[PDB]
């Protein structure tokens with residue numbers, strides 16, 4: 001696998017040992033060959049599982065995930081997908097890694113797509129080797145891959161709302177259930193229904209993931225209610241997955257606004273990763289997968305692939321050259337390589353709006369490309385009336401940095417800034433100049 005100009009897709013089935021058995025063998029070989037190596041974890045929870053698997057190999061942990069003292073002699077770096085892309089965008093030297101290993105390489109967050117595009121471009125140029133580890137590479141059509149033990153697959157109607165009757169099979173279960181919901185808000189309503197029926201529920205989403213995931217280890221629980229983030233290598237001691245098979249799709253309408261479309265069907269990759277949370281113990285057959293809909297290729301036209309192009313257009317590769325998307329996912333967006341390339345100062349603004357501002361890529365780009373500076377929040381208030389953000393069915397209001405109460409009415413509307421209570425709270429703090 002470790003020959004230059006090679007990209008290997010390590011597509012062993014979920015629970016086959018990619019992370020705990022194969023990755024340490026690769027790293028040991030890399031260190032033997034003196035290859036400067038990066039290991040890309042999708043989340044800090046995976047970064048911590050990798051540290052355990054790699055314990056006593058010389059690896060530099062470039063993450064808060066882990067508390068380890070580095071010797072300064074490591075040639076193997078480990079960091080999150082998002083950190084890799086972040087450091088590429090910033091005026092910080094990223095070494096030209098000879099070997100690029102991406103774990104959970106199916107991850108469809110914009111920074112992950114961009115990282116794959118950058119790495120695969122370097123391999124295509126003959127500059128580096130790469131290994132993408134995932135049971136579900138781009139365009140997979142198999143929602144039911146092999147498992148360590150047999151799975152009971154049942155097509156069943158799955159609740160997406162509180163229920164009073166008709167789903168006795170959900171609560172009649174005496175084991176532990178991981179339930180994939182299409183949104184935080186939908187998870188909140190299901191979680192409250194289960195709690196009222198006496199169940200112990202933990203809720204996971206992107207913003208709460210590291211903190212809340214520890215509860216699945218530290219305390220007893222009956223249900224985990226999670227968004228699609230638990231597709232990226234999150235392990236549970238569970239015997240059932242309930243899968244809505246639905247997700248929200250960010251969609252850019254008329255180049256002008258982002259809406260959250262759906263819920264609509266997940267991809268086959270997503271369905272296989274949701275299912276792949278169970279059947280992992282060869283000694284525990286008959287884990288159950290209950291699925292509530294079909295799969296479809298809903299990544300086509302999904303805003304994440306356009307956002308990935310915005311990131312890659314702003315990463316230096318060589319002279320004016322621009323990294324392409326990884327070939328199998330390059331048709332998911334109709335974008336012109338370089339159309340989003342920003343001048344030095346606008347690019348700095350773009351980066352800060354993402355890193356400090358915590359704005360979605362698409363929205364960061366609109367602001368930066370309009371020549372607005374990072375701390376100038378007038379655009380949060382000067383949009384058309386149709387861009388008014390609602391809070392409990394009244395216009396949301398914030399005090400501006402000037403001390404004026406104003407209606408939140410952003411010049412560009414991205415539904416992700418107000419998709420749930422936590423998101424809207426964060427965007428109000430931004431509009432107020434609080435970060």
Ligand SMILES: COc1ccc2[nH]cc(CN(C)C)c2c1
Pocket residue numbers: 385386387388390393394395
């Ligand atoms: C106070 O102003 C309001 C309250 C409720 C509303 N429902 C629809 C609109 C108009 N839209 C631009 C928010 C509206 C305005």
